[PDB]
UniProtKB/Swiss-Prot annotation, chain A:
Residues 193-231, 762-780 are annotated as: Interaction with SF3B1 and SF3B5. Pfam families: Beta-prop_RSE1_1st (PF10433), Beta-prop_RSE1_2nd (PF23726), CPSF_A (PF03178). Keywords: mRNA processing, mRNA splicing, Nucleus, Phosphoprotein, Spliceosome. The modification Phosphothreonine is found at residue 1172. It comes from Homo sapiens. GO terms for molecular function: protein-containing complex binding; U2 snRNA binding. Its main location: nucleus. This is Splicing factor 3B subunit 3. The record marks 284, 306, 352, 429, 888 as: Interaction with SF3B5.
Curated annotation (Swiss-Prot), chain B:
The gene is SF3B5. The keyword Phosphoprotein applies. It comes from Homo sapiens. This is Splicing factor 3B subunit 5. Keywords: Acetylation, mRNA processing, mRNA splicing, Nucleus, Phosphoprotein, RNA-binding, Spliceosome. Component of the 17S U2 SnRNP complex, a ribonucleoprotein complex that contains small nuclear RNA (snRNA) U2 and a number of specific proteins. Part of the SF3B subcomplex of the 17S U2 SnRNP complex. SF3B associates with the splicing subcomplex SF3A and a 12S RNA unit to form the U2 small nuclear ribonucleoproteins complex (U2 snRNP). Within the SF3B subcomplex, interacts directly with SF3B1 (via HEAT domain) and SF3B3. Component of the minor spliceosome, which splices U12-type introns. Transmembrane segments: none annotated.
UniProtKB/Swiss-Prot annotation, chain C:
It is found in: Nucleus; Nucleus speckle. The chain holds residues 9 to 89 of 110 of the full protein. This is PHD finger-like domain-containing protein 5A. The record marks 9 as: Interaction with SF3B3. Component of the 17S U2 SnRNP complex, a ribonucleoprotein complex that contains small nuclear RNA (snRNA) U2 and a number of specific proteins. Part of the SF3B subcomplex of the 17S U2 SnRNP complex. SF3B associates with the splicing subcomplex SF3A and a 12S RNA unit to form the U2 small nuclear ribonucleoproteins complex (U2 snRNP). Within the SF3B complex interacts directly with SF3B1 and SF3B3. Component of the minor spliceosome, which splices U12-type introns. Within this complex, interacts with CRIPT. Interacts (via N-terminus) with U2AF1 and SRSF5; acts to bridge the two. Belongs to the PHF5 family. The keyword Transferase does not apply. It comes from Homo sapiens (Human). Zn(2+) 2 binds at residues 15, 18, 50, 53. The gene is PHF5A. One of its GO terms (cellular component) is U2 snRNP. Residues 27-43 are annotated as: Interaction with SF3B1 and SF3B3. Zn(2+) 1 binds at residues 3, 38, 41, 77.
Length: 1189, 70, 81
């Protein structure tokens, strides 16, 4: 089973962000790690929107990023720490839009290893030195120097290894131009390992150690080391020299502490808590991340707590000594993986999960309605500062990067009765959870809608002057009339300014700098800022093709007439009229380049079912250049630049792109409707809009094309639009309607509609008749609303029973104080506390139809919708619940299965009964009109019963906890939590569940899918996919002995079952998969295995249909592994072979990097493939379009 | 061979259950810290911030299996 | 015995007789990764020493493909001592 992997949706989750002048210019970019991908973002300081400049799969695990700058340099470098074990320095090359590898220095073996450096990266602020540190023992420092040519130079690593030492964080200390110093929060574990009592573990203290690099002597000395009062989670570099007092803030449990070496005393400030906090009082508070803002005369830090609350932190100084730390509450935003404050006054908040935000900083947090806390204030221990969380005051939201991380569950189905299946995606964590519906397409924004009388057939948009930044007129052609509208303040109908005529119009263009030209079947009208051209004899104008300085028309009998405008301004008809082999059905004429005075090539489509290119230069005017036969009669033509391409839309739904540089072409069926072609302006470039049954948009993106449909109805005509109301839109007419639309959000390849959920969604099931979703949502550390209310009631009573008139008011205020969990965080209940709900939801618009709330500390883990044989038509929802589950160390008070009778056409849950079970019912699967429930390691068949479920059969031979259950016929595939796949047969007459086969490997299975009766695709916690198959002549007709013989004498193999599954495929995706589904993503496309991930990636695995594909892509992958090796210094084959050797999968994420190589390499690689680069690019496009969009 | 001692978490014929499991647990926590997706999974499962999950794993590195046998 | 100090920027060298051999396995098949040696092994008289035998180095030393796959490029400075 040979397979090709393609990413459809790149990962959207962010784990690191760094900011800098990576382009080497005044403006700042952000480089973000998405784990497997490195990406460059530009926030536009004008429009607010954040543009992705570049995305690169690095086929490795990024573990650290730093920006750094050599002293005197204008441009920032990216230094990368990764699982590779090689330190990589990249420079962004703005001209080529690529990350260029400036250095790659090697120090260890690959993988996320304990003692090999890569996890922690620290750079000296001046950029003189970089230290890469492992979690344990090994730390390496590389000196950085600038050569005469100004190219970067990396020194040989200097060893700084201290055995038995765990490092929590390392940061570079700003010492100005004194010797570089790094600071590490470290704990030595030697004594704990040698103490049988455990006292040594308890009395081991973290230390802050400063390692100084003596630049002169090339050695790293462990110059100071000091025990901390409490364990810090991370460090912040404080500005030094002229900028600040140097030193490093330690963020720790409940505290922030400032330390510097020498005479500087410790200053410590407690982290202010929320007043009236509903959280468990046992919970400490940490800062999760920080940003620094350094300004010409001052600096401050932003630090965010676990609740999402940001504090502005400032340091008061007397001489060079810090005297106090001051904390002002700034704003509350979603909990962040990273924060970057940009020089232009924006805060970028890379969310831990879900959508990322750009905020403008409206105010610097220099109000005083809200108090500023200080390390100098008198306070007790156990006592604390309290602040009030309140809506956004210092921040204004300006962009939101819609992000799928984490995808917890997925179903690909049509639930809308569209042509194409949608992806129903369970997303987010906690109160930022959502169900998202993904469609292949672009979001459309209806700017205006005005109904038109009669049946309009055409429309154009014409400027008044060439220098006009916005259009002036919209012209609509009906059957017997054309109408002109002035797009002024009131978009009103005009008559005088326009002239035109009563008759239908074939074209309206701005010919001169200010001259308008109308083409109608009875002739041509020219309107200077009026010259009339009657059609010769009884003929009429059939087709036309206009330009900035050219006008070509096609008359009945296929007679071409050519007009060219002279610089004086008038039109001059050519002294010759050419006839064609047949009548003309469509024409196209490329726009004139800014420098030239006329375009050369003219595309003409004939009833001959052929297209012909004709020169318009006076040397060979109206002369044949190159013809071409087409599978059907053409409907539209469009020449466009990005190279030159001729787009051909036929009478049937087929569309063709051809390259007229010399050429070859590629085609695809859109059919059902004749394809029309229009010129549209998208993202400041020329894009083509093809119209059939759907409106598709073809546009080039970094020399890589895209053909994405519009999530919209059928349209009949369209033209480019640009006004002050809509700077870059499209005017489109449909049957008896005129519409002004805009394409604002690409949303990548998948537009999203999101419906909020209340807790983290674990699973959902589609109810088959009414197509509603039954969703189970469940969080740990959570209060149910009943408990959340009761907690609130007791805290109000306690606040009164702590003056008492004011206390009563504050308690009444607090009972009404009801800040949204989505913004301020769901209040964290203690360990082992759970909240869970069952929601019935409509997938068309996410209205909750029904909402069952479960008891406090009930956690729903499984759900199924089914019929039972006894009750026939009646529908049931079975929900499996853990009671009082503790995760770590694991224990549980057993579980329950709740049964509900689905009623009111699957819109309401009628509770039926609650059935106890001994351990978590972790999987439920309908089987042969009965339900199969996996309770811990026990697989049981349960009949509905009346007052409780009845256990018809049970199997106790499963090795460990059961995570999932798939079924096909009498076969049951059980996913063990660690021991991978077990195949079971239900013996129907004999009432037995028999294990007949197992895997030969441990796999930490997360999800599974059946490919066929014998074959299972699985995914695991370690970012792998596998396919396991039963070998031919595997027998499922197996016994289990009634006396005991088959557990005593007769037996299985290697301490597993007697028969074994073959692993026929292995592949490291690079990221954890929780959904697998075999499906077709496009109507009349090939079937594919679709997967989804915790970083929000969507990808496919697609079967090669023949060796003519397989062995070609095998050779492509082989050459790209050597000619285009992974950016951050990994071996690609090693990365795809992370946990098991790669088997029968070719990486299309690598193969599609062919298109992103420089032409020097594209040539060389294509030569070793016996092909030219366009043929390689086409064969890559062909396999994507065959299954993927 | 002697040179294997350059590398922590190797063993030898008198390596105990406790020594071996403490290396498995320490290597596991370091792997969880590096693999962003494996860290995602635990943060979602516990309903806890990725920064607190990392901190809790670092705290577990000191004595991951409880004290040495005796 | 091999030196196994952390390797640096200095490139390992081979004499004509040992030219094209892999320092680790002594095969002449498919040189792939450039050998890197520690500064101490490439200092003064030690500079330019053949990695395998210490003779004047006429060419750059290369670890073979089989060794690069096994990450034996990563063990440290393969100067024989
Ligand atoms: Zn070798
Ligand atoms: Zn050496
Ligand atoms: Zn030699």
């Amino acid at each position: 089973m040979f397979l090709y992997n393609l990413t459809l949706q790149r990962a959207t989750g962010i784990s690191f962000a760094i900011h800098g002048n990576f382009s080497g210019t005044k403006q700042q970019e952000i480089v973000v790690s998405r784990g497997k991908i490195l990406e460059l973002l530009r926030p536009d300081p004008n429009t607010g929107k954040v543009h992705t400049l570049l995305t690169v799969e690095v086929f490795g695990v990024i573990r650290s990023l730093m920006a750094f700058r050599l002293t005197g340099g204008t441009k920032d470098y990216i230094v990368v720490g990764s699982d590779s074990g090689r330190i990589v320095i990249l420079e962004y090359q703005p001209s080529k839009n690529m990350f260029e590898k400036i250095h790659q220095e090697t120090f260890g073996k690959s993988g996320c290893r304990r003692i090999v450096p890569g996890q922690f990266l620290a750079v000296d602020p001046k950029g003189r030195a970089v230290m890469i540190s492992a979690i344990e023992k090994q730390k390496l420092v590389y000196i950085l120097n600038r050569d005469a040519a100004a190219r970067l130079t990396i020194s040989s690593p200097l060893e700084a290894h201290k055995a038995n030492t765990l490092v929590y964080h390392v940061v570079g200390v700003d010492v100005g131009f004194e010797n570089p110093m790094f600071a590490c929060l470290e704990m030595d574990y030697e004594e704990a390992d040698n103490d049988p009592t455990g006292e040594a573990a308890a009395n081991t203290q973290q230390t802050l150690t400063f390692y100084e690099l003596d630049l002169g002597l090339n050695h790293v000395v462990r110059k100071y080391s000091e025990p901390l009062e409490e364990h810090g989670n991370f460090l912040i570099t404080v500005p030094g020299g002229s900028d600040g007092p140097s030193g490093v803030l330690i963020c720790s449990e409940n505290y922030i502490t400032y330390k510097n070496f020498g005479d500087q005393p410790d200053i410590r400030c407690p982290i202010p808590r929320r007043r009236n906090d509903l959280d468990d009082p046992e919970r400490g508070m940490i800062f999760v991340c920080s940003a620094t803002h350094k300004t010409k005369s001052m600096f401050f830090f932003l630090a965010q707590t676990e609740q999402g609350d940001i504090f502005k932190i400032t340091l008061e100084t007397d001489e060079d000594m810090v005297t106090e730390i001051r904390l002002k509450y700034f704003d509350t935003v979603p909990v962040a993986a990273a924060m970057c404050v940009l020089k232009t006054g924006f805060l970028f908040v890379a969310s831990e999960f879900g959508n990322h935000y750009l905020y403008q900083i409206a105010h610097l947090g220099d109000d005083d309605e809200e108090p500023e806390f200080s390390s100098a204030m008198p306070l007790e221990e156990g006592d604390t500062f309290f602040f009030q969380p309140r809506p956004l005051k210092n921040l204004v939201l300006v962009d939101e990067l819609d992000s799928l991380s984490p995808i917890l569950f997925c179903q690909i189905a049509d639930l809308a009765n569209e042509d194409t299946p949608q992806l129903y995606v369970a997303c987010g964590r906690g109160p930022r959870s959502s169900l998202r519906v993904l469609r292949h397409g672009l979001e459309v924004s209806e700017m205006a809608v005005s109904e038109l009388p009669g049946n309009p057939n055409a429309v154009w948009t014409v400027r008044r002057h060439i220098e006009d930044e916005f259009d002036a007129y919209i012209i609509v052609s009906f059957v017997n009339a054309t109408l002109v509208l002035s797009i002024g303040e009131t978009v009103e109908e005009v008559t005088d300014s326009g002239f035109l005529g009563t008759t239908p119009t074939l074209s309206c263009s701005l010919l001169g700098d200010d001259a308008l030209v109308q083409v109608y079947p009875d002739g041509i009208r020219h309107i200077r800022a009026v010259n009339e051209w009657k059609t010769p004899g009884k003929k009429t104008i059939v087709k036309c093709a206009v330009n900035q300085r050219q006008v070509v028309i096609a008359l009945t009998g296929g007679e071409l007439v050519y007009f060219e405008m002279d610089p004086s301004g008038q039109l001059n008809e050519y002294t010759e009229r050419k006839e064609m082999s047949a009548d003309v059905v469509c024409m196209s004429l490329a726009n004139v380049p800014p420098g030239e005075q006329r375009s050369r090539f003219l595309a003409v489509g004939l009833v001959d079912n052929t297209v012909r290119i004709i020169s318009l230069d006076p040397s060979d005017c109206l002369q044949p250049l190159s013809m071409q036969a087409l599978p059907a009669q053409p409907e539209s033509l469009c020449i466009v630049e990005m190279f030159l391409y001729l787009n051909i839309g036929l009478q049937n739904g087929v569309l063709l792109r051809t390259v007229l540089d010399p050429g070859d072409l590629s085609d695809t069926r859109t059919g059902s409707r004749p394809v029309k072609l229009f010129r549209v302006r998208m993202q400041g470039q020329e894009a083509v809009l093809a119209m059939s049954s759907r409106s598709w948009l073809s546009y080039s993106y970094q020399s890589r094309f895209h053909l994405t449909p519009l999530s919209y109805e059928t349209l009949e005509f369209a033209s480019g639009f640009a006004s002050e109301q809509c700077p870059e839109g499209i005017v489109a007419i449909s049957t008896n309607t005129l519409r002004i639309l805009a394409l604002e959000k690409l949303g990548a390849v998948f537009n999203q509609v999101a419906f909020p959920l209340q807790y983290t969604p674990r699973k959902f099931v589609i109810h088959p008749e009414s197509n509603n979703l039954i969703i189970i949502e469940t969080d740990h550390n959570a209060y149910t609303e009943a408990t959340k209310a009761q907690r609130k009631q007791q805290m109000a009573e306690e606040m009164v029973e702590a003056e008492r008139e004011l206390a009563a008011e504050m308690a009444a205020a607090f009972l009404n104080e009801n800040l949204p969990e989505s913004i301020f965080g769901a209040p964290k209940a203690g360990n082992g506390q759970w909240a869970s709900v069952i929601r019935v939801m409509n997938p068309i618009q996410g209205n909750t139809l029904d909402l069952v709330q479960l008891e406090q500390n009930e956690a729903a883990f499984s759900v199924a919708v089914c019929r039972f044989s006894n009750t026939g038509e009646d529908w049931y929802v079975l929900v499996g619940v853990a009671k009082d589950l503790i995760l770590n160390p694991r224990s549980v008070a057993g579980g329950f299965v709740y049964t509900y009778k689905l009623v009111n056409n699957g819109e309401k849950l009628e509770f039926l009964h609650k059935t106890p079970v001994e351990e978590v019912p972790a999987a439920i699967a309908p089987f042969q009109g009965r339900v199969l429930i996996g309770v811990g390691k026990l697989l049981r068949v349960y009949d509905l019963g009346k007052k409780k479920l009845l256990r018809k059969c049970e199997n106790k031979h499963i090795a460990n906890y059961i995570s999932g259950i798939q079924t096909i016929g009498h076969r049951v595939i059980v996913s063990d939590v660690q021991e991978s796949f077990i195949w079971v047969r239900y013996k129907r007459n004999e009432n037995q569940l028999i294990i007949f086969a197992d895997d030969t490997y441990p796999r930490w299975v997360t999800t599974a899918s059946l490919l066929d009766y014998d074959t299972v695709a699985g995914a695991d916690k370690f970012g792998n996919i596998c396919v396991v198959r039963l070998p031919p002549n595997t027998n499922d007709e197996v016994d289990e002995d009634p006396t005991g013989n088959k557990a005593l004498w007769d037996r299985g193999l290697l301490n597993g079952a007697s028969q074994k599954a073959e692993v026929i495929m292995n592949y490291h995706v690079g990221e954890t998969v929780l959904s697998l589904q075999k499906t077709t993503l496009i109507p009349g496309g090939s079937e594919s295995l679709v997967y989804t991930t915790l970083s929000g990636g969507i990808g496919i695995l697609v079967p090669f249909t023949s060796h003519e594909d397989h062995d070609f892509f095998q050779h492509v992958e082989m050459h790209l592994r050597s000619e285009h090796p992974p950016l951050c210094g990994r071996d690609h084959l090693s990365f795809r072979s992370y946990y098991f050797p790669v088997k029968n999968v070719i990486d299309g994420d690598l193969c599609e990097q062919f298109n992103s190589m420089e032409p020097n390499k594209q040539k060389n690689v294509s030569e070793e493939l016996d092909r030219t680069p366009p043929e390689v690019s086409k064969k890559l496009e062909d396999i994507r379009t065959r299954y993927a969009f | 061979e002697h040179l294997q001692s350059k590398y922590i978490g190797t063993g030898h014929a008198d390596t105990t259950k406790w020594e071996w499991l403490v290396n498995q647990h320490r290597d596991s926590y370091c792997s969880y810290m590096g693999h962003f997706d494996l860290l995602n999974y635990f943060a979602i499962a516990e309903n806890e911030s990725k920064a607190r999950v990392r901190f809790n794993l670092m705290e577990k590195m000191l004595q991951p299996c409880g004290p040495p046998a005796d | 015995i091999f030196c196994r100090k952390q390797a640096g920027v200095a490139i390992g060298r081979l004499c004509e007789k040992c030219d094209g051999k892999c320092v680790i396995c002594d095969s002449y098949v498919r040189p792939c990764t450039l050998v890197r040696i520690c500064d101490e092994c490439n200092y003064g008289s030690y500079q330019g020493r053949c990695v395998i035998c210490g003779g004047p180095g006429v060419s750059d030393a290369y670890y073979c493909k089989e060794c690069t796959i096994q990450e034996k490029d990563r063990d440290g400075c393969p100067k024989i001592v």
